[PDB]
Amino acid sequence: ADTTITQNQTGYDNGYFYSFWTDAPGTVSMTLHSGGSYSTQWRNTGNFVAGKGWATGGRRTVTYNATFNPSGNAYLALYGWTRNPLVEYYIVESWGTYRPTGTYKGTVTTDGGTYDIYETWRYNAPSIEGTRTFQQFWSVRQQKRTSGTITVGNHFDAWARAGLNLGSHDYQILATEGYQSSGSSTVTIGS
Template identity: 65%
Template structure:
Protein backbone atom coordinates (compact mmCIF):
# COMPACT_ATOMS: atom_id res chain seq x y z
CA UNK A 1 0.00 0.00 0.00
CA UNK A 2 0.63 2.90 1.08
CA UNK A 3 -1.58 3.57 3.73
CA UNK A 4 -0.12 3.80 6.95
CA UNK A 5 1.56 2.63 9.36
CA UNK A 6 2.22 1.93 12.49
CA UNK A 7 0.01 2.32 15.11
CA UNK A 8 -0.32 -0.28 17.28
CA UNK A 9 2.31 -2.66 18.17
CA UNK A 10 3.71 -1.93 21.57
CA UNK A 11 6.97 -0.17 21.63
CA UNK A 12 9.71 -2.50 20.98
CA UNK A 13 7.42 -5.51 21.15
CA UNK A 14 4.51 -7.20 19.52
CA UNK A 15 2.30 -4.88 21.45
CA UNK A 16 3.50 -1.64 19.85
CA UNK A 17 0.44 0.17 18.67
CA UNK A 18 0.17 0.71 15.10
CA UNK A 19 -0.26 -0.03 11.54
CA UNK A 20 2.02 -0.30 8.66
CA UNK A 21 1.53 0.14 4.98
CA UNK A 22 1.48 -3.04 3.06
CA UNK A 23 -1.11 -4.89 1.11
CA UNK A 24 -1.69 -8.48 2.02
CA UNK A 25 -3.95 -10.99 0.34
CA UNK A 26 -6.91 -12.14 2.41
CA UNK A 27 -7.62 -15.84 2.79
CA UNK A 28 -10.78 -17.76 3.53
CA UNK A 29 -9.89 -17.57 7.21
CA UNK A 30 -9.11 -13.86 7.12
CA UNK A 31 -11.98 -12.51 5.05
CA UNK A 32 -12.16 -8.76 4.46
CA UNK A 33 -15.39 -7.09 3.44
CA UNK A 34 -15.23 -3.56 2.14
CA UNK A 35 -17.06 -0.89 0.19
CA UNK A 36 -13.78 0.79 -0.76
CA UNK A 37 -10.81 -1.45 -1.49
CA UNK A 38 -7.58 -1.00 0.51
CA UNK A 39 -5.26 1.52 -1.09
CA UNK A 40 -4.96 5.25 -1.61
CA UNK A 41 -6.64 7.69 -3.95
CA UNK A 42 -8.84 10.76 -4.19
CA UNK A 43 -12.56 11.02 -3.55
CA UNK A 44 -14.80 14.06 -3.83
CA UNK A 45 -11.97 16.53 -3.39
CA UNK A 46 -10.06 14.70 -0.63
CA UNK A 47 -7.21 12.21 -0.47
CA UNK A 48 -7.96 8.92 1.26
CA UNK A 49 -5.88 6.04 2.55
CA UNK A 50 -7.15 2.63 3.69
CA UNK A 51 -4.70 0.01 4.91
CA UNK A 52 -5.42 -3.33 6.56
CA UNK A 53 -3.25 -6.33 7.32
CA UNK A 54 -6.06 -8.56 6.03
CA UNK A 55 -7.10 -10.17 9.29
CA UNK A 56 -10.66 -9.82 10.50
CA UNK A 57 -13.43 -7.82 8.87
CA UNK A 58 -13.26 -4.10 8.09
CA UNK A 59 -15.57 -2.08 5.87
CA UNK A 60 -14.42 1.40 4.85
CA UNK A 61 -16.73 3.80 3.01
CA UNK A 62 -15.80 7.05 1.27
CA UNK A 63 -18.77 9.38 1.61
CA UNK A 64 -19.55 12.91 0.39
CA UNK A 65 -16.82 15.54 0.71
CA UNK A 66 -14.50 14.94 3.63
CA UNK A 67 -16.68 12.30 5.25
CA UNK A 68 -15.86 8.62 5.71
CA UNK A 69 -17.17 5.78 7.84
CA UNK A 70 -15.60 2.53 8.94
CA UNK A 71 -16.75 -0.55 10.81
CA UNK A 72 -14.40 -3.27 12.00
CA UNK A 73 -14.75 -6.61 13.74
CA UNK A 74 -12.02 -8.81 15.25
CA UNK A 75 -9.31 -7.12 13.20
CA UNK A 76 -5.61 -7.38 13.84
CA UNK A 77 -4.70 -3.94 12.49
CA UNK A 78 -6.11 -1.37 10.08
CA UNK A 79 -5.92 2.40 9.53
CA UNK A 80 -8.13 4.50 7.30
CA UNK A 81 -9.25 8.05 6.74
CA UNK A 82 -9.49 11.16 4.58
CA UNK A 83 -7.27 14.22 4.31
CA UNK A 84 -4.72 15.67 1.91
CA UNK A 85 -1.70 14.83 -0.19
CA UNK A 86 0.71 16.40 0.36
CA UNK A 87 0.34 17.12 4.05
CA UNK A 88 1.08 20.61 5.36
CA UNK A 89 1.25 22.78 8.48
CA UNK A 90 -2.41 23.63 7.98
CA UNK A 91 -5.26 24.19 10.38
CA UNK A 92 -8.02 21.64 9.95
CA UNK A 93 -11.23 20.68 11.70
CA UNK A 94 -13.19 17.49 12.09
CA UNK A 95 -16.47 16.22 13.54
CA UNK A 96 -18.00 12.83 14.01
CA UNK A 97 -18.50 9.80 16.19
CA UNK A 98 -16.18 7.03 17.32
CA UNK A 99 -17.12 3.75 18.98
CA UNK A 100 -13.66 2.75 20.11
CA UNK A 101 -13.36 4.18 23.59
CA UNK A 102 -13.08 0.82 25.35
CA UNK A 103 -10.95 -1.07 22.83
CA UNK A 104 -7.53 -0.62 21.25
CA UNK A 105 -8.25 2.15 18.76
CA UNK A 106 -7.21 5.74 17.89
CA UNK A 107 -8.59 8.86 16.34
CA UNK A 108 -5.53 10.76 15.08
CA UNK A 109 -4.13 13.13 12.49
CA UNK A 110 -1.74 10.77 10.74
CA UNK A 111 0.92 11.34 8.09
CA UNK A 112 4.29 10.56 6.51
CA UNK A 113 7.32 12.50 5.33
CA UNK A 114 10.33 11.50 3.23
CA UNK A 115 13.97 12.58 3.52
CA UNK A 116 13.87 11.79 6.36
CA UNK A 117 11.27 9.05 6.37
CA UNK A 118 9.00 9.78 9.36
CA UNK A 119 5.60 8.53 10.42
CA UNK A 120 3.68 10.89 12.69
CA UNK A 121 0.54 11.04 14.83
CA UNK A 122 -1.43 13.76 16.56
CA UNK A 123 -3.65 11.54 18.70
CA UNK A 124 -6.96 13.16 19.61
CA UNK A 125 -8.45 10.18 21.43
CA UNK A 126 -7.38 6.64 22.28
CA UNK A 127 -9.14 3.68 23.81
CA UNK A 128 -7.70 0.96 26.02
CA UNK A 129 -4.08 1.55 25.03
CA UNK A 130 -2.22 4.84 25.58
CA UNK A 131 0.52 5.09 22.93
CA UNK A 132 2.71 7.05 25.34
CA UNK A 133 2.93 4.08 27.71
CA UNK A 134 6.48 3.01 28.43
CA UNK A 135 8.09 5.86 26.51
CA UNK A 136 10.17 8.85 27.51
CA UNK A 137 8.31 12.13 27.18
CA UNK A 138 10.12 14.85 25.23
CA UNK A 139 7.86 17.63 26.44
CA UNK A 140 4.32 18.94 26.06
CA UNK A 141 2.40 21.73 24.35
CA UNK A 142 -0.93 23.43 24.86
CA UNK A 143 -2.95 23.79 21.67
CA UNK A 144 -6.60 23.93 20.65
CA UNK A 145 -7.88 23.85 24.21
CA UNK A 146 -5.84 20.90 25.42
CA UNK A 147 -2.42 19.62 26.42
CA UNK A 148 -0.51 17.16 24.25
CA UNK A 149 2.42 15.03 25.40
CA UNK A 150 5.23 14.72 22.85
CA UNK A 151 7.42 11.67 22.37
CA UNK A 152 9.33 9.67 19.77
CA UNK A 153 9.48 5.93 19.10
CA UNK A 154 11.36 3.85 16.52
CA UNK A 155 10.22 1.23 14.03
CA UNK A 156 12.87 -1.24 12.93
CA UNK A 157 12.63 -3.05 9.58
CA UNK A 158 8.92 -2.43 9.27
CA UNK A 159 6.64 -1.67 6.30
CA UNK A 160 6.46 1.99 5.29
CA UNK A 161 5.44 4.10 2.30
CA UNK A 162 8.89 3.24 0.91
CA UNK A 163 8.88 -0.48 1.62
CA UNK A 164 10.52 -2.21 4.59
CA UNK A 165 12.54 0.43 6.45
CA UNK A 166 13.69 1.67 9.84
CA UNK A 167 12.19 5.04 10.76
CA UNK A 168 11.07 7.18 13.72
CA UNK A 169 7.53 7.91 14.77
CA UNK A 170 6.67 11.34 16.18
CA UNK A 171 3.71 11.62 18.55
CA UNK A 172 1.56 14.28 20.14
CA UNK A 173 -1.01 12.61 22.43
CA UNK A 174 -3.85 14.71 23.78
CA UNK A 175 -4.47 14.37 27.51
CA UNK A 176 -8.09 15.56 27.32
CA UNK A 177 -9.61 13.10 24.87
CA UNK A 178 -12.04 14.43 22.28
CA UNK A 179 -13.70 13.51 19.00
CA UNK A 180 -14.22 16.74 17.09
CA UNK A 181 -12.53 20.11 17.03
CA UNK A 182 -9.80 22.11 15.35
CA UNK A 183 -6.18 20.98 15.01
CA UNK A 184 -3.50 23.60 14.39
CA UNK A 185 -1.00 21.20 12.86
CA UNK A 186 1.74 23.84 12.63
CA UNK A 187 1.78 24.09 16.43
CA UNK A 188 2.75 20.42 16.65
CA UNK A 189 5.31 20.59 13.85
CA UNK A 190 6.96 23.59 15.54
CA UNK A 191 6.98 21.84 18.92
CA UNK A 192 8.52 18.70 17.44
CA UNK A 193 11.26 20.79 15.87
CA UNK A 194 11.88 22.46 19.22
CA UNK A 195 12.49 19.04 20.77
CA UNK A 196 14.79 17.92 17.97
CA UNK A 197 12.24 15.92 15.94
CA UNK A 198 12.84 16.81 12.30
CA UNK A 199 10.24 16.13 9.60
CA UNK A 200 11.04 15.82 5.89
CA UNK A 201 9.10 16.48 2.69
CA UNK A 202 5.43 15.83 3.23
CA UNK A 203 3.58 12.89 1.76
CA UNK A 204 -0.06 12.25 2.71
CA UNK A 205 -1.87 13.42 5.84
CA UNK A 206 -5.26 12.07 6.99
CA UNK A 207 -7.59 12.22 9.98
CA UNK A 208 -7.45 8.51 10.66
CA UNK A 209 -9.33 5.85 12.55
CA UNK A 210 -7.09 2.99 13.58
CA UNK A 211 -7.94 -0.28 15.27
CA UNK A 212 -5.71 -3.00 16.68
CA UNK A 213 -7.03 -6.41 17.79
CA UNK A 214 -10.46 -4.93 18.36
CA UNK A 215 -13.96 -4.22 17.03
CA UNK A 216 -15.66 -0.85 16.64
CA UNK A 217 -16.89 1.86 14.29
CA UNK A 218 -16.49 5.54 13.43
CA UNK A 219 -17.99 8.20 11.18
CA UNK A 220 -15.73 11.23 10.65
CA UNK A 221 -15.87 14.38 8.50
CA UNK A 222 -12.72 16.46 7.89
CA UNK A 223 -12.35 19.98 6.51
CA UNK A 224 -9.65 22.59 6.01
CA UNK A 225 -10.24 25.55 8.34
Template identity: 55%
Template sequence: MVSFTSLFVATVAAAGALAAPATNMTIEATVPSLVERGGTPSSTGTNNGYYYSWWTDGAAQATYTNNGGGSYSLSWSGNNGNLVGGKGWNPGSSSRTVHYSGTYQPNGNSYLSVYGWTRNALIEYYVVESYGSYNPSSAAQKKGTVSCDGASYDVLSTWRYNAPSIDGTQTFQQFWSVRNPKKNPGGSISGSVTVSCHFNAWRQFGMALGSSFDYQIVATEGYQSSGSSSITVS
Protein backbone atom coordinates in the same frame (compact mmCIF):
# COMPACT_ATOMS: atom_id res chain seq x y z
CA MET B 1 -0.34 0.44 20.13
CA VAL B 2 2.98 1.99 19.17
CA SER B 3 4.16 -1.35 17.85
CA PHE B 4 1.04 -2.45 16.00
CA THR B 5 0.18 1.01 14.67
CA SER B 6 3.45 1.69 12.99
CA LEU B 7 3.44 -1.80 11.54
CA PHE B 8 0.00 -1.82 9.98
CA VAL B 9 -0.42 1.88 9.25
CA ALA B 10 2.89 2.06 7.51
CA THR B 11 1.70 -0.80 5.35
CA VAL B 12 -1.07 1.46 4.02
CA ALA B 13 1.34 2.95 1.54
CA ALA B 14 2.83 -0.36 0.52
CA ALA B 15 -0.50 -2.14 0.18
CA GLY B 16 -2.48 0.79 -1.14
CA ALA B 17 0.06 1.73 -3.79
CA LEU B 18 -0.67 -1.54 -5.51
CA ALA B 19 -4.44 -1.14 -5.42
CA ALA B 20 -6.55 0.83 -7.88
CA PRO B 21 -8.43 3.82 -6.39
CA ALA B 22 -12.13 3.38 -5.87
CA THR B 23 -14.34 5.03 -8.43
CA ASN B 24 -17.53 4.88 -6.37
CA MET B 25 -18.37 6.24 -2.95
CA THR B 26 -18.14 2.76 -1.47
CA ILE B 27 -15.17 0.55 -2.26
CA GLU B 28 -16.47 -2.81 -3.43
CA ALA B 29 -14.99 -6.14 -2.37
CA THR B 30 -13.89 -7.60 -5.71
CA VAL B 31 -10.69 -9.38 -4.63
CA PRO B 32 -10.22 -13.03 -3.60
CA SER B 33 -12.36 -14.70 -0.97
CA LEU B 34 -9.97 -14.23 1.97
CA VAL B 35 -10.17 -10.45 1.65
CA GLU B 36 -13.90 -10.57 0.96
CA ARG B 37 -14.40 -12.28 4.31
CA GLY B 38 -12.54 -9.30 5.79
CA GLY B 39 -14.94 -6.85 4.16
CA THR B 40 -13.65 -3.86 2.16
CA PRO B 41 -10.31 -4.51 0.43
CA SER B 42 -7.35 -2.15 0.86
CA SER B 43 -7.15 0.88 -1.43
CA THR B 44 -5.87 4.46 -1.71
CA GLY B 45 -6.80 7.29 -4.03
CA THR B 46 -8.93 10.41 -4.28
CA ASN B 47 -12.63 10.78 -3.53
CA ASN B 48 -14.74 13.94 -3.80
CA GLY B 49 -11.67 16.17 -3.72
CA TYR B 50 -9.94 14.44 -0.78
CA TYR B 51 -7.22 11.84 -0.57
CA TYR B 52 -8.14 8.63 1.23
CA SER B 53 -6.13 5.71 2.52
CA TRP B 54 -7.60 2.41 3.68
CA TRP B 55 -5.74 -0.75 4.67
CA THR B 56 -6.80 -3.97 6.39
CA ASP B 57 -5.07 -7.32 6.82
CA GLY B 58 -8.43 -9.02 6.23
CA ALA B 59 -8.62 -10.67 9.65
CA ALA B 60 -11.39 -8.44 10.98
CA GLN B 61 -14.80 -7.97 9.43
CA ALA B 62 -14.40 -4.34 8.37
CA THR B 63 -16.32 -2.01 6.09
CA TYR B 64 -14.80 1.28 4.95
CA THR B 65 -16.94 3.72 2.94
CA ASN B 66 -16.03 7.02 1.29
CA ASN B 67 -18.96 9.39 1.69
CA GLY B 68 -19.53 12.88 0.27
CA GLY B 69 -16.83 15.53 0.54
CA GLY B 70 -14.37 14.85 3.34
CA SER B 71 -16.57 12.25 5.03
CA TYR B 72 -15.88 8.57 5.58
CA SER B 73 -17.30 5.82 7.75
CA LEU B 74 -15.74 2.69 9.16
CA SER B 75 -17.06 -0.24 11.18
CA TRP B 76 -15.10 -3.27 12.30
CA SER B 77 -15.74 -6.32 14.47
CA GLY B 78 -14.32 -9.67 15.53
CA ASN B 79 -11.57 -8.44 17.88
CA ASN B 80 -9.05 -9.59 15.32
CA GLY B 81 -6.58 -8.13 12.87
CA ASN B 82 -5.21 -4.70 11.98
CA LEU B 83 -6.88 -1.87 10.03
CA VAL B 84 -6.66 1.87 9.42
CA GLY B 85 -8.55 4.28 7.20
CA GLY B 86 -9.27 7.93 6.74
CA LYS B 87 -9.44 11.01 4.53
CA GLY B 88 -7.29 14.10 4.14
CA TRP B 89 -4.72 15.42 1.68
CA ASN B 90 -1.73 14.40 -0.37
CA PRO B 91 0.65 16.07 -0.02
CA GLY B 92 0.30 17.14 3.59
CA SER B 93 1.18 20.58 4.90
CA SER B 94 3.03 22.18 7.80
CA SER B 95 0.53 25.06 8.00
CA ARG B 96 -2.86 23.38 7.73
CA THR B 97 -5.53 23.53 10.44
CA VAL B 98 -7.36 20.21 10.29
CA HIS B 99 -11.02 20.17 11.34
CA TYR B 100 -12.87 16.97 12.13
CA SER B 101 -16.30 16.04 13.45
CA GLY B 102 -18.54 13.01 13.72
CA THR B 103 -18.75 9.94 15.93
CA TYR B 104 -16.03 7.64 17.25
CA GLN B 105 -16.97 4.50 19.18
CA PRO B 106 -14.05 2.11 19.76
CA ASN B 107 -14.17 -1.04 21.84
CA GLY B 108 -10.56 -1.95 22.61
CA ASN B 109 -7.33 -0.76 20.98
CA SER B 110 -7.96 2.11 18.58
CA TYR B 111 -6.79 5.66 17.71
CA LEU B 112 -8.36 8.72 16.16
CA SER B 113 -5.52 10.92 14.97
CA VAL B 114 -4.09 13.29 12.41
CA TYR B 115 -1.61 10.95 10.78
CA GLY B 116 0.99 11.31 8.06
CA TRP B 117 4.48 10.86 6.69
CA THR B 118 7.40 13.00 5.54
CA ARG B 119 10.47 12.20 3.48
CA ASN B 120 13.98 13.65 3.73
CA ALA B 121 13.94 12.52 6.56
CA LEU B 122 11.48 9.61 6.59
CA ILE B 123 9.19 10.30 9.58
CA GLU B 124 5.83 8.80 10.59
CA TYR B 125 3.80 11.20 12.75
CA TYR B 126 0.64 11.28 14.84
CA VAL B 127 -1.44 13.88 16.62
CA VAL B 128 -3.71 11.61 18.68
CA GLU B 129 -7.00 13.21 19.67
CA SER B 130 -8.67 10.15 21.20
CA TYR B 131 -8.01 6.47 21.72
CA GLY B 132 -9.62 3.35 23.12
CA SER B 133 -8.15 1.09 25.78
CA TYR B 134 -4.44 1.65 25.00
CA ASN B 135 -2.54 4.91 25.58
CA PRO B 136 0.33 5.20 23.07
CA SER B 137 2.25 7.36 25.55
CA SER B 138 3.06 4.20 27.49
CA ALA B 139 5.45 2.85 24.85
CA ALA B 140 7.41 5.88 23.64
CA GLN B 141 9.98 8.30 25.07
CA LYS B 142 8.39 11.44 26.46
CA LYS B 143 10.08 14.66 25.40
CA GLY B 144 7.77 17.13 27.13
CA THR B 145 4.37 18.74 26.70
CA VAL B 146 2.86 21.33 24.41
CA SER B 147 -0.37 23.35 24.51
CA CYS B 148 -2.18 23.53 21.17
CA ASP B 149 -5.75 24.57 20.36
CA GLY B 150 -6.58 24.92 24.06
CA ALA B 151 -5.44 21.41 25.04
CA SER B 152 -2.32 19.80 26.50
CA TYR B 153 -0.45 17.10 24.59
CA ASP B 154 2.36 14.77 25.60
CA VAL B 155 5.18 14.90 23.04
CA LEU B 156 6.93 11.59 22.42
CA SER B 157 9.22 9.87 19.98
CA THR B 158 10.31 6.33 19.22
CA TRP B 159 12.20 4.40 16.56
CA ARG B 160 11.01 1.68 14.23
CA TYR B 161 13.67 -0.71 12.93
CA ASN B 162 13.39 -2.56 9.61
CA ALA B 163 9.66 -1.84 9.53
CA PRO B 164 7.22 -1.21 6.67
CA SER B 165 6.99 2.39 5.50
CA ILE B 166 5.88 4.44 2.51
CA ASP B 167 9.33 3.66 1.06
CA GLY B 168 9.35 -0.06 1.77
CA THR B 169 11.18 -1.64 4.70
CA GLN B 170 13.10 1.10 6.50
CA THR B 171 14.37 2.28 9.89
CA PHE B 172 12.69 5.56 10.84
CA GLN B 173 11.43 7.68 13.72
CA GLN B 174 7.85 8.18 14.87
CA PHE B 175 6.79 11.56 16.31
CA TRP B 176 3.76 11.78 18.59
CA SER B 177 1.53 14.37 20.24
CA VAL B 178 -1.02 12.59 22.45
CA ARG B 179 -3.85 14.68 23.87
CA ASN B 180 -3.90 14.49 27.67
CA PRO B 181 -6.59 13.96 28.72
CA LYS B 182 -7.90 12.38 25.54
CA LYS B 183 -11.24 13.36 24.08
CA ASN B 184 -13.67 10.82 25.43
CA PRO B 185 -14.63 8.22 22.84
CA GLY B 186 -18.03 6.60 22.68
CA GLY B 187 -20.10 9.08 20.72
CA SER B 188 -19.93 12.54 19.16
CA ILE B 189 -16.46 14.01 18.73
CA SER B 190 -15.10 17.13 17.04
CA GLY B 191 -12.14 19.45 17.12
CA SER B 192 -9.39 21.27 15.28
CA VAL B 193 -5.69 20.49 15.04
CA THR B 194 -3.29 23.30 14.10
CA VAL B 195 -0.48 21.13 12.83
CA SER B 196 2.12 23.93 12.90
CA CYS B 197 1.72 24.15 16.69
CA HIS B 198 2.75 20.52 17.03
CA PHE B 199 5.43 20.60 14.35
CA ASN B 200 7.07 23.70 15.88
CA ALA B 201 7.03 22.11 19.34
CA TRP B 202 8.55 18.93 17.98
CA ARG B 203 11.36 20.95 16.41
CA GLN B 204 12.07 22.61 19.76
CA PHE B 205 12.44 19.15 21.27
CA GLY B 206 14.93 18.18 18.56
CA MET B 207 12.33 16.31 16.48
CA ALA B 208 12.63 17.67 12.94
CA LEU B 209 10.20 16.48 10.29
CA GLY B 210 11.37 15.85 6.75
CA SER B 211 11.38 18.51 4.06
CA SER B 212 8.84 16.75 1.80
CA PHE B 213 5.31 15.84 2.87
CA ASP B 214 3.49 12.70 1.79
CA TYR B 215 -0.17 12.16 2.78
CA GLN B 216 -1.86 13.70 5.86
CA ILE B 217 -5.21 12.27 6.96
CA VAL B 218 -7.59 12.00 9.90
CA ALA B 219 -7.31 8.28 10.53
CA THR B 220 -9.32 5.75 12.49
CA GLU B 221 -7.26 2.72 13.49
CA GLY B 222 -8.09 -0.56 15.17
CA TYR B 223 -6.10 -3.54 16.41
CA GLN B 224 -7.72 -6.74 17.67
CA SER B 225 -10.76 -4.68 18.60
CA SER B 226 -14.16 -3.61 17.34
CA GLY B 227 -15.93 -0.32 16.84
CA SER B 228 -17.20 2.28 14.43
CA SER B 229 -16.51 5.82 13.33
CA SER B 230 -18.12 8.32 11.00
CA ILE B 231 -15.82 11.30 10.48
CA THR B 232 -15.92 14.42 8.32
CA VAL B 233 -12.59 16.12 7.58
CA SER B 234 -12.05 19.67 6.35
Protein backbone atom coordinates in the same frame (compact mmCIF):
# COMPACT_ATOMS: atom_id res chain seq x y z
CA ALA C 1 -23.95 4.30 -3.85
CA ASP C 2 -21.24 5.20 -1.33
CA THR C 3 -17.91 3.53 -2.16
CA THR C 4 -16.75 1.00 0.41
CA ILE C 5 -13.02 0.15 0.43
CA THR C 6 -11.62 -3.11 1.80
CA GLN C 7 -8.16 -3.53 0.17
CA ASN C 8 -4.96 -1.42 0.45
CA GLN C 9 -5.64 1.67 -1.67
CA THR C 10 -5.24 5.43 -2.02
CA GLY C 11 -7.44 7.63 -4.18
CA TYR C 12 -9.94 10.46 -4.25
CA ASP C 13 -13.56 10.83 -3.22
CA ASN C 14 -15.82 13.92 -3.35
CA GLY C 15 -12.82 16.19 -3.63
CA TYR C 16 -10.71 14.62 -0.93
CA PHE C 17 -7.74 12.27 -0.83
CA TYR C 18 -8.22 8.99 1.04
CA SER C 19 -5.90 6.21 2.16
CA PHE C 20 -6.73 2.72 3.35
CA TRP C 21 -4.23 0.22 4.68
CA THR C 22 -4.56 -3.02 6.64
CA ASP C 23 -2.56 -6.19 7.24
CA ALA C 24 -5.80 -8.03 7.97
CA PRO C 25 -8.00 -7.88 4.85
CA GLY C 26 -11.64 -8.74 5.48
CA THR C 27 -11.66 -7.49 9.08
CA VAL C 28 -12.18 -3.79 8.40
CA SER C 29 -13.92 -1.56 5.87
CA MET C 30 -14.02 2.15 5.11
CA THR C 31 -17.00 3.82 3.49
CA LEU C 32 -16.62 7.13 1.68
CA HIS C 33 -19.42 9.64 2.09
CA SER C 34 -19.95 13.14 0.68
CA GLY C 35 -17.43 15.94 1.15
CA GLY C 36 -14.78 15.17 3.74
CA SER C 37 -16.77 12.36 5.37
CA TYR C 38 -16.00 8.70 5.91
CA SER C 39 -16.88 5.83 8.18
CA THR C 40 -15.16 2.65 9.23
CA GLN C 41 -16.07 -0.53 11.02
CA TRP C 42 -13.90 -3.40 12.10
CA ARG C 43 -14.13 -6.74 13.85
CA ASN C 44 -11.14 -8.79 15.13
CA THR C 45 -8.68 -6.77 13.11
CA GLY C 46 -4.93 -6.98 12.95
CA ASN C 47 -3.72 -3.49 12.15
CA PHE C 48 -5.30 -0.81 9.95
CA VAL C 49 -5.14 2.92 9.30
CA ALA C 50 -7.72 4.72 7.17
CA GLY C 51 -9.06 8.22 6.59
CA LYS C 52 -9.73 11.15 4.32
CA GLY C 53 -7.48 14.13 3.93
CA TRP C 54 -4.73 15.33 1.59
CA ALA C 55 -2.18 13.81 -0.78
CA THR C 56 0.42 16.25 0.45
CA GLY C 57 0.56 17.17 4.11
CA GLY C 58 1.59 20.66 5.39
CA ARG C 59 0.79 23.24 8.06
CA ARG C 60 -3.00 23.21 7.64
CA THR C 61 -5.57 24.15 10.23
CA VAL C 62 -7.84 21.11 10.22
CA THR C 63 -11.39 21.11 11.57
CA TYR C 64 -13.22 17.87 12.20
CA ASN C 65 -16.16 16.14 13.82
CA ALA C 66 -16.35 12.45 14.65
CA THR C 67 -18.03 9.65 16.54
CA PHE C 68 -15.42 7.16 17.71
CA ASN C 69 -16.58 3.84 19.19
CA PRO C 70 -13.66 1.51 19.70
CA SER C 71 -13.94 -1.79 21.55
CA GLY C 72 -10.32 -2.19 22.48
CA ASN C 73 -7.13 -0.59 21.18
CA ALA C 74 -7.77 2.19 18.65
CA TYR C 75 -6.76 5.77 17.78
CA LEU C 76 -8.43 8.84 16.23
CA ALA C 77 -5.62 11.04 14.96
CA LEU C 78 -4.29 13.38 12.32
CA TYR C 79 -1.79 10.99 10.73
CA GLY C 80 0.86 11.30 8.04
CA TRP C 81 4.27 10.49 6.62
CA THR C 82 7.44 12.25 5.54
CA ARG C 83 10.56 11.24 3.59
CA ASN C 84 14.19 12.29 4.05
CA PRO C 85 13.83 11.66 7.04
CA LEU C 86 11.32 8.77 6.97
CA VAL C 87 8.79 9.55 9.74
CA GLU C 88 5.24 8.34 10.57
CA TYR C 89 3.53 10.99 12.67
CA TYR C 90 0.45 11.19 14.89
CA ILE C 91 -1.60 13.93 16.56
CA VAL C 92 -3.82 11.76 18.78
CA GLU C 93 -7.20 13.28 19.73
CA SER C 94 -8.78 10.14 21.16
CA TRP C 95 -7.90 6.53 21.86
CA GLY C 96 -9.44 3.24 22.96
CA THR C 97 -8.20 1.14 25.89
CA TYR C 98 -4.54 2.04 25.32
CA ARG C 99 -3.17 5.60 25.47
CA PRO C 100 -0.18 5.80 23.12
CA THR C 101 3.20 6.57 24.81
CA GLY C 102 6.95 6.58 24.01
CA THR C 103 10.11 8.33 25.11
CA TYR C 104 8.83 11.54 26.79
CA LYS C 105 9.72 14.77 24.94
CA GLY C 106 7.72 17.51 26.67
CA THR C 107 4.33 19.04 25.99
CA VAL C 108 2.60 21.41 23.58
CA THR C 109 -0.50 23.49 24.28
CA THR C 110 -2.62 24.28 21.24
CA ASP C 111 -6.29 24.50 20.24
CA GLY C 112 -7.49 24.65 23.84
CA GLY C 113 -5.76 21.43 24.85
CA THR C 114 -2.46 20.13 26.14
CA TYR C 115 -0.65 17.27 24.39
CA ASP C 116 2.26 15.14 25.56
CA ILE C 117 5.03 14.65 22.99
CA TYR C 118 6.62 11.23 22.48
CA GLU C 119 9.05 9.50 20.15
CA THR C 120 9.06 5.79 19.27
CA TRP C 121 10.84 3.59 16.76
CA ARG C 122 9.27 0.96 14.50
CA TYR C 123 11.64 -1.86 13.58
CA ASN C 124 11.33 -3.84 10.30
CA ALA C 125 7.74 -2.70 9.87
CA PRO C 126 5.56 -1.77 6.94
CA SER C 127 6.00 1.83 5.80
CA ILE C 128 5.30 4.02 2.73
CA GLU C 129 8.69 2.96 1.28
CA GLY C 130 8.19 -0.72 2.17
CA THR C 131 9.65 -2.63 5.12
CA ARG C 132 11.89 -0.09 6.90
CA THR C 133 12.93 0.98 10.40
CA PHE C 134 11.85 4.53 11.22
CA GLN C 135 10.85 7.06 13.87
CA GLN C 136 7.33 7.87 14.98
CA PHE C 137 6.49 11.32 16.37
CA TRP C 138 3.41 11.71 18.57
CA SER C 139 1.35 14.52 20.08
CA VAL C 140 -1.13 12.84 22.43
CA ARG C 141 -3.97 14.87 23.99
CA GLN C 142 -4.07 14.64 27.79
CA GLN C 143 -7.88 14.30 27.59
CA LYS C 144 -9.77 12.61 24.70
CA ARG C 145 -11.98 14.65 22.34
CA THR C 146 -13.82 13.89 19.09
CA SER C 147 -14.33 17.33 17.51
CA GLY C 148 -12.39 20.57 17.16
CA THR C 149 -9.61 22.31 15.31
CA ILE C 150 -6.06 21.00 14.91
CA THR C 151 -3.47 23.69 14.18
CA VAL C 152 -0.94 21.31 12.66
CA GLY C 153 1.87 23.91 12.54
CA ASN C 154 1.92 24.19 16.35
CA HIS C 155 2.54 20.45 16.68
CA PHE C 156 5.18 20.48 13.93
CA ASP C 157 7.04 23.33 15.66
CA ALA C 158 6.88 21.71 19.07
CA TRP C 159 8.29 18.50 17.58
CA ALA C 160 11.07 20.52 15.95
CA ARG C 161 11.92 22.22 19.29
CA ALA C 162 12.11 18.77 20.94
CA GLY C 163 14.60 17.48 18.33
CA LEU C 164 12.03 15.65 16.23
CA ASN C 165 12.70 16.79 12.64
CA LEU C 166 10.29 16.05 9.77
CA GLY C 167 11.25 15.59 6.12
CA SER C 168 9.35 16.14 2.86
CA HIS C 169 5.63 15.50 3.38
CA ASP C 170 3.63 12.63 1.85
CA TYR C 171 -0.13 12.19 2.73
CA GLN C 172 -1.86 13.52 5.80
CA ILE C 173 -5.28 12.27 6.92
CA LEU C 174 -7.66 12.42 9.89
CA ALA C 175 -7.29 8.70 10.47
CA THR C 176 -9.01 5.95 12.40
CA GLU C 177 -6.45 3.31 13.43
CA GLY C 178 -7.19 -0.04 15.10
CA TYR C 179 -4.98 -2.74 16.56
CA GLN C 180 -6.18 -6.23 17.71
CA SER C 181 -9.65 -4.89 18.44
CA SER C 182 -13.15 -4.25 17.03
CA GLY C 183 -15.19 -1.03 16.65
CA SER C 184 -16.47 1.73 14.37
CA SER C 185 -16.03 5.42 13.58
CA THR C 186 -17.51 8.25 11.50
CA VAL C 187 -15.34 11.30 10.85
CA THR C 188 -15.79 14.51 8.84
CA ILE C 189 -12.75 16.65 8.04
CA GLY C 190 -12.30 20.16 6.67
CA SER C 191 -9.79 23.00 6.57
